[PDB]
Each structure stands twice: as structure tokens, then as C-alpha cells.
Write a protein that binds this ligand. Structure first.
Ligand code: SF4
Length: 207
């Protein structure tokens, strides 16, 4: 099933990342430039999971390098969370996209639940390798990957969650994806930014 046979029997993140470059667990490896594995080290206490690598990530080979990554950096700084404590990754590891004539970027397309479930073996390997105390789920795709396809991020803000089939029973905090805070009226963006900082502080205060 899915990516499972492509995942080697190791918790070494460099070896896992190299193996993900050879993954054919769903169709997304075909058009993407490369797999984008998570970044950070196994001592990280906080793991953060987004949806997928975007246009800039697909070419950088690293998660959270675009405008949404810069906004997340601003929120992490505001939450007094250092990168040293972080392992950051995405629910799926290959960019799914299309282009529009006149566009200034490749347009991210939503991974199907089928793709998320196919790629989940990599997320499980990362979680087994890092043993985080807390997992921050950025957006619906990531939150549903671990909490269920019916899960609604909008209904559980600020809440520390724990589910049974997650490796190591870490705390889980589901929040908005930073990409959503880039647009909208100023007062709504400012209120949303504050709520993202609040959710990051909840996660950082676990244990
Ligand atoms: S998105 Fe995940 S399962 Fe699909 S080919 Fe890429 S690494 Fe494999």
C-alpha cells in the first residue's frame, strides 16, 4: 500500500530523506521537481506538519521557504519558539500543481485523501524518528491526516488533542495554515496572526 514499501527500516532522517527521493507511492513524484522531506533534527520536541511543499519549496528542496514560511517565522519568533527545537515537514512530500497563463507561480492543488494516506508512512517514520512531545498541524490536510477525514480545524482552536493510533501519543494542536494569513483585510489578518501565535504557545507549553 502507498509509500510503505519505499520506506527503509531506519530512523535516520538523512537515509529516510534519500529514500523518499525514490518514492513512487502515489502519482505526485512524476511532475514534481524532487521530494521535499522534513527539516530539523531528531532531538526536536516540536514537530510541525503542513499540507505539501509549495512552488518555492519544490525547488529549494526544503519546507516553508515561501511567503507562508516567512509568516510562520514571524509567528514562531512572536511565540518565542526557536528553530533548534523544530522538525518541520508536510503531509505529502511532492508538490501537486498546475499553471495558469499569465501566472507568477505554479498553483498548488489539494492532495486527495488517497495521496495523503499513500504518503502517511513517511510521516509515521518521521514521528517515530523524532519522537516529538507535540505535533502542530498547519491546515486541514495535515490535521485530517492524523485526526480523521471529518476533523474540522475551525472547531478545535486552542485545544490540546491526543488520539490513539498516533506513534508515541504526542500532544496534537491543529491550527490554521500560515498561507491563509497572507490575504484578507488587515484587522482579520492581525487577529488571525495572534491566534496562530496563541496555538504555537499552547504547543510549546506542552510538558
Ligand atoms: S507524495 Fe509521498 S507517497 Fe506520493 S510519490 Fe511523493 S513521497 Fe511518495
Amino acid at each position: 500500500a502507498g509509500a510503505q514499501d519505499f520506506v527503509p527500516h531506519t530512523a535516520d532522517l538523512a537515509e529516510l530523506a534519500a529514500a523518499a527521493g525514490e518514492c513512487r507511492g502515489c502519482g505526485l513524484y512524476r511532475d514534481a521537481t524532487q521530494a521535499v522531506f522534513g527539516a530539523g533534527g531528531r532531538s526536536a520536541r516540536i514537530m510541525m506538519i503542513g499540507e505539501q511543499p509549495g512552488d518555492k519549496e519544490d525547488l529549494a528542496g526544503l519546507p516553508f521557504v515561501g511567503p507562508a514560511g516567512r509568516l510562520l517565522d514571524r509567528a514562531l519568533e512572536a511565540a518565542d519558539i526557536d528553530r533548534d527545537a523544530l522538525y518541520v515537514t508536510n503531509a505529502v512530500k511532492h508538490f501537486k500543481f498546475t499553471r495558469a497563463a499569465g501566472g507568477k507561480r505554479r498553483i498548488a492543488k489539494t492532495p486527495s485523501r488517497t495521496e495523503v494516506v499513500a504518503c502517511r508512512p513517511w510521516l509515521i517514520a518521521e514521528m517515530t524518528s523524532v519522537e516529538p512531545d507535540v505535533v502542530v498541524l498547519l491546515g486541514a490536510t495535515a490535521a485530517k491526516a492524523l485526526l480523521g477525514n471529518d476533523f474540522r480545524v475551525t472547531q478545535h482552536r486552542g485545544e490540546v488533542l491526543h488520539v490513539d493510533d498516533v506513534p508515541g501519543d504526542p500532544a496534537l494542536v491543529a491550527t490554521v495554515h500560515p498561507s491563509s494569513l497572507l490575504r484578507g483585510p488587515k484587522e482579520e489578518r492581525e487577529s488571525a496572526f495572534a491566534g496562530l501565535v496563541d496555538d504555537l504557545r499552547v504547543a510549546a507549553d506542552v510538558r
